[PDB]
Structure 1
Amino acid sequence: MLAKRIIACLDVKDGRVVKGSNAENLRDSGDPVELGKFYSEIGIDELVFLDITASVEKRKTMLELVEKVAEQIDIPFTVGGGIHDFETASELILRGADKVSINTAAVENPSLITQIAQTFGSQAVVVAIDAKRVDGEFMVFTYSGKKNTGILLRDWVVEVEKRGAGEILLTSIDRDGTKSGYDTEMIRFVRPLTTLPIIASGGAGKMEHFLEAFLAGADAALAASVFHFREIDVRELKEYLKKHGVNVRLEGL
């Protein structure tokens, strides 16, 4: 059966991971190399490096992060945050990013998905879909959740797979950071619409939330807060999930 993955989202500013959380077991929890390597060693399956500024000097600083991270970590990582075009995605993958996450640029140019997939393989292209329920209908939002595109989530999911994406990173904006649970209604809504792996994102607060995301059909669970704020232990989480039938990888724990 398909693997079920636990993925940590590391928010990045100026090539460093947003700090303020005290990893007194680490020398510098702002270092993407040291932090990513640590997560790799404690059982995280993949990383996402999300540039949350996505703007000034982002291009160069993210390239340097990729160069340093790729040579030191042994689990896959995705980069995202303001990847606007094929050349930017290409540079990141060529420097060692395993995957790139595109969102606004994909909505505005869906064949960008296909271009990356054809050059680098579909597995290198993650389409991040940020959605909200708008008057009872799931809609796609771009520009960090500030633009309702008026595109129905249902239609965009189908198009994204048609365009050759390898995975969908499905973020419920309205649960993100709330620690209130993943948007399992959204996950369940998307599940029958695509055969692609769905990375659920936004809302994780406790181990049981991960179980619910997987029961809703997620193939991976992404979380920022619970790892950033050191609220959940990765090994304890995987043991609990495996006990409840979820096909997580316990190797190396």
Structure 2
Amino acid sequence: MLAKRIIACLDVKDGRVVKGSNFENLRDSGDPVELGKFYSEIGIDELVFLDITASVEKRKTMLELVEKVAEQIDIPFTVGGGIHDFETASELILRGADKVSINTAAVENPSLITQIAQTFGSQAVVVAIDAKRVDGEFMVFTYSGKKNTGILLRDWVVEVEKRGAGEILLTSIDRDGTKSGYDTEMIRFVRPLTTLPIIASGGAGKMEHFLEAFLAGADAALAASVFHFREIDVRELKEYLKKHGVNVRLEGL
């Protein structure tokens, strides 16, 4: 059966991971190399480095981050946040990013998905879809949740798979950072519309929330707050999930 993955989202600003969360067991929790390697050693399956400014000095600072992280970490990582074109995506993958996450650029040029997939393989392209329920209908939002595109989530999911994406990173903006639980209604809604791996994102607060995300059909669970604020232990989480029948990897823990 398909593996169920636990993925940590590391928010980046100026090529360093946003700090303030006291990793007294580490020399510098702002260093993408040290922090990424740490997660690799305690059981995280993959990482996402999300540039949350995704603006100034971004392109160059993210390239340097990729160069350093790629030579030191042994689990897959995705880079996202403001990747606006094929050349930017190509530069990141060429330097060692395993995958790139595109969102607004994919909505504005759907064949960008296919271009990256044809050159680097479908597994290198993650389409991040940010959605909200608008008067009872799931809609796709771009520009960091500030633009309702008018495109129904149902239609965009189907199109993204047709364009050759490898995976969908499905974020519920309205649950993101709330610690109130993943948006399992949204995950269940998307599950029958695609065969691709679905990475659920936004809302994790406790171990049981991960179980619900996987029972709703997620293939991976991404979280930022619970790992950044050290609210959930990775090994504890994986042991709980495996006890409840979820196919997480316990090897190396």
- Normalising by the smaller structure, the TM-score range is over 0.9
TM-score calculated relative to the size of structure 1: 1.00
Give the 4+ runs in structure 1 shifted more than 2 A. Answer: none
Deviation, 1:177, is: 0.1
CA offsets, 1:194-230, max 9 Å, x none? Answer: 0000000000000000000000000000000000000
Deviation, 1:61, is: 0.2
Deviation, 1:16, is: 0.1
Deviation, 1:148, is: 0.2
1: CA distance between counterparts of 2:94 and 2:4? Answer: 27
1: CA distance between counterparts of 2:93 and 2:203? Answer: 29
2: CA distance between counterparts of 1:111 and 1:229? Answer: 38
1: CA distance between counterparts of 2:168 and 2:2? Answer: 15
Report the counterpart of residue 189 of structure 1 in structure 2: 189
- SS state at 1:139 partner: strand
Deviation, 1:50, is: 0.0
Deviation, 1:173, is: 0.1
- SS state at 1:241 partner: helix
- SS state at 1:71 partner: helix
> Aligned-pair RMSD on alpha carbons?
0.1
CA offsets, 1:90-119, max 9 Å, x none? Answer: 000000000000000000000000000000
2: CA distance between counterparts of 1:44 and 1:150? Answer: 36
Deviation, 1:136, is: 0.1
1: CA distance between counterparts of 2:214 and 2:41? Answer: 23
- 5+ long unaligned stretches in structure 2: none
Deviation, 1:234, is: 0.1
Deviation, 1:84, is: 0.1
Deviation, 1:124, is: 0.1
Report the counterpart of residue 57 of structure 2 in structure 1: 57
Deviation, 1:176, is: 0.1
Deviation, 1:53, is: 0.1
- SS state at 1:204 partner: coil
Report the counterpart of residue 175 of structure 2 in structure 1: 175
- 5+ long unaligned stretches in structure 1: none
Q: How does 1:96-111 map to 2 (within 5 A)?
A: 96-111=96-111
Deviation, 1:238, is: 0.1
- SS state at 1:88 partner: helix
Q: How does 1:1-253 map to 2 (within 5 A)?
A: 1-253=1-253
Deviation, 1:89, is: 0.1
Deviation, 1:65, is: 0.1
TM-score calculated relative to the size of structure 2: 1.00
Deviation, 1:49, is: 0.0
2: CA distance between counterparts of 1:67 and 1:231? Answer: 30
2: CA distance between counterparts of 1:99 and 1:147? Answer: 25
- SS state at 1:150 partner: strand
1: CA distance between counterparts of 2:246 and 2:153? Answer: 26
CA offsets, 1:164-189, max 9 Å, x none? Answer: 00000000000000000000000000
CA offsets, 1:50-88, max 9 Å, x none? Answer: 000000000000000000000000000000000000000
2: CA distance between counterparts of 1:226 and 1:149? Answer: 30
- SS state at 1:217 partner: coil
2: CA distance between counterparts of 1:164 and 1:71? Answer: 28
Deviation, 1:251, is: 0.3
1: CA distance between counterparts of 2:36 and 2:242? Answer: 23
- Provide the identity percentage: 100
- SS state at 2:195 partner: coil
- SS state at 2:139 partner: strand
Aligned length: 253
CA offsets, 1:18-66, max 9 Å, x none? Answer: 0000000000000000000000000000000000000000000000000
